[PDB]
Design a protein around this ligand. Structure first.
Ligand SMILES: Nc1ncnc2c1ncn2[C@@H]1O[C@H](COP(=O)(O)OP(=O)(O)OP(=O)(O)O)[C@@H](O)[C@H]1O
Ligand SMILES: [Mg+2]
Lengths: 297, 257
């Protein structure tokens, strides 16, 4: 693979380094996404080093496929399979009518399959959100954007304290725990599950403290009963307001019993008790899952 | 809990795939095991100076041995390959990797910034960006979960012994990381507590003391002879309280195996 066989079509995003182009293989007809990464006199960005080495190990139907790395003097192109839309654009197009339940359930099932596979291959994603999930016309949804991902160890050590865009960021990151692990990706998926149902973000804070207080007002302020060791966490304050946990049926009102049960396990405070992606695949919420095509262009 | 078994299984598959060629030094016309030993010892000091993770060191040595399995290098360039490998491992593994200038600086200006950057690119091409390799370190930390109860000295001593195996391609290039970790864990356990490789790890790994014996016999000798080895940076490093001063523990005279 090389640049002469590709014909650029249009800009479809700009992460950094920075652009992503839709392009066409002239000899095979394959449509692809070209992520350009500009080569700072600091060499290859660590984000690209991780993104590429992790992607080369992850071959799964629900993880975006890295096809090739075009590798010249001043430029680095990543060639990906092209997908029509991101989940964030799809939810905007569904503004008024909403997203059919069978699609939501199909997408969650697939996201969980994708994530279980990541976690099984010792990879933390760390930036799950709607704009990083890609959908095609056949009804697939795929994890994309592995620029914040990392290979973890067993047991984990302390990793980067930043991590996860704020709205989707787990309480254990927000409370500054020295160790976090696969549970943080599940927390993000639970937020996205809620968001597919309501079509607005579950906890849209603008600062770390605002984000915590929104979580506390929805799920109750955690005590040592619900989350042993929480009151000793670095950024825990005994002055935190103590909100009652509200009727969980009020958090995402259209959800029925099985959906609520599943959502409650993904948003459990204690990362130890929080459901794994593997165990969630077997939740009764999925007893009747199918894979419909999206109902929209 | 979840994924511990899946991850172990996956690392056991990948370590076969990421393994350097056992013969490679005999195909290198200009460098030797002795030169490699010197380089690896220097990388330990670099790790000391910049306070890098142990995992970063094991990754770098893995990148070097894989690079040298397909690329002939002259002795004056071996250190450049080592510098780029350490830079890559740092970018992969560290929260705060040192900057490129810091890597140029510690080669005592043998090389330029442009050389280091060009070698980084070359090493990535040759490895085809396959950077997520299993190390002795990554097997050790899983094996540590099977202690009863956890013992900081056993852990530190196992890491020390795993690190010593990095220095000598003869014989260690012929053993898989999971096997070296098994030998280092047993030997540490035996040294500090008198206990043996636990049956719970036989269930997990499928390795017995019988199948670990060849590696363990080598490692035991390495341990006995460590104070007389020409490379001393690992012993110095493991005198620090960070590693519970384990390099000052006396090796056992015999193992019973
Ligand atoms: N394979 C693909 N097919 C179609 N669109 C894609 C693909 N990869 C990326 N995009 C589009 O480009 C956007 C940015 O790419 P990506 O998220 O991988 O990188 P990024 O650096 O995080 O960018 P951003 O921060 O803008 O999301 C995505 O949200 C998506 O809309
Ligand atoms: Mg993105």
């Amino acid at each position: 693979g090389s640049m002469e066989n590709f014909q650029k079509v249009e800009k479809i995003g700009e992460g950094t380094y920075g652009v992503v182009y839709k392009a066409r293989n002239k000899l095979t007809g394959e449509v692809v996404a070209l992520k350009k990464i500009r080569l700072e006199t600091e060499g290859v960005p660590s984000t690209a080093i991780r993104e590429i080495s992790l992607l080369k190990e992850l071959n799964h139907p629900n993880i975006v496929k890295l096809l090739d790395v075009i590798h010249t003097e001043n430029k680095l192109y990543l060639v990906f399979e092209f997908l029509s839309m991101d989940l964030k654009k799809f939810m905007d197009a569904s503004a008024l009518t909403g997203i059919p339940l069978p699609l939501i359930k199909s997408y969650l099932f697939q996201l969980l399959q994708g994530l279980a596979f990541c976690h099984s291959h010792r990879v933390l994603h760390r930036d799950l959100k709607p704009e990083n999930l890609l959908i095609n016309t056949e009804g697939a949804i795929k994890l994309a954007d592995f620029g914040l991902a990392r290979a973890f160890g067993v047991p984990v050590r302390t990793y980067t304290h930043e991590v996860v865009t704020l709205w989707y960021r787990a309480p254990e990151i927000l409370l500054g725990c020295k160790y976090y692990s696969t549970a943080v990706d599940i927390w993000s998926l639970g937020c996205i599950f809620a968001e597919m149902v309501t079509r607005r973000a579950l906890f849209p804070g603008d600062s770390e403290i605002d984000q915590l207080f929104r979580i506390f007002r929805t799920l109750g302020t955690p005590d040592e009963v619900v989350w042993p060791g929480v009151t000793s966490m670095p950024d825990y304050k005994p002055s935190f307001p103590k909100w009652a946990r509200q009727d969980f049926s009020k958090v995402v009102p259209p959800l029925d019993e099985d959906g609520r049960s599943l959502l409650s396990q993904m948003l459990h405070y204690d990362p130890n008790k929080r459901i794994s992606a593997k165990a969630a695949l077997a939740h009764p919420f999925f007893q009747d899952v199918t894979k419909p095509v999206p109902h929209l262009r | 809990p979840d994924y511990h078994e899946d991850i172990h299984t996956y690392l056991r598959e990948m370590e076969v795939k990421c393994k350097p060629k056992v013969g490679y030094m005999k195909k290198q016309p200009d460098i030797t095991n002795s030169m490699r030993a010197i380089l690896v010892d220097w990388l330990v000091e670099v790790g000391e100076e910049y306070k890098l993770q142990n995992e970063t060191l094991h990754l770098a040595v893995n990148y070097i041995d894989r690079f040298l399995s397909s690329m002939s290098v002259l002795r004056g360039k071996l250190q450049l390959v080592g510098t780029a490998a350490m830079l890559l491992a740092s970018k992969f593994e560290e929260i705060y990797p040192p900057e490129v200038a810091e890597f140029v600086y510690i080669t005592d200006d043998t090389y330029t910034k442009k050389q280091v950057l060009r070698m980084e690119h070359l090493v990535l091409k040759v490895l085809t960006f396959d950077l997520a390799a299993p190390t002795v370190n990554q097997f050790l930390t899983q094996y540590f979960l099977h202690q009863q109860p956890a013992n900081c000295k056993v852990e530190s001593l196992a890491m020390f012994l795993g690190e010593l195996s990095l220095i000598d391609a003869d014989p260690y290039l012929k053993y898989l990381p999971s096997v070296i970790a098994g030998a280092a864990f047993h030997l540490a356990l035996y040294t500090v507590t008198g206990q043996s490789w636990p049956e719970s790890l036989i269930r997990k790994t499928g390795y017995t003391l019988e199948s670990l014996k060849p590696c363990l016999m080598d490692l035991h000798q390495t341990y006995l002879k460590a104070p007389q080895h020409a490379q001393q940076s690992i012993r110095e490093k493991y005198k620090n309280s960070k590693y519970h001063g384990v390099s000052l523990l006396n090796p056992p005279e015999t193992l019973n195996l």
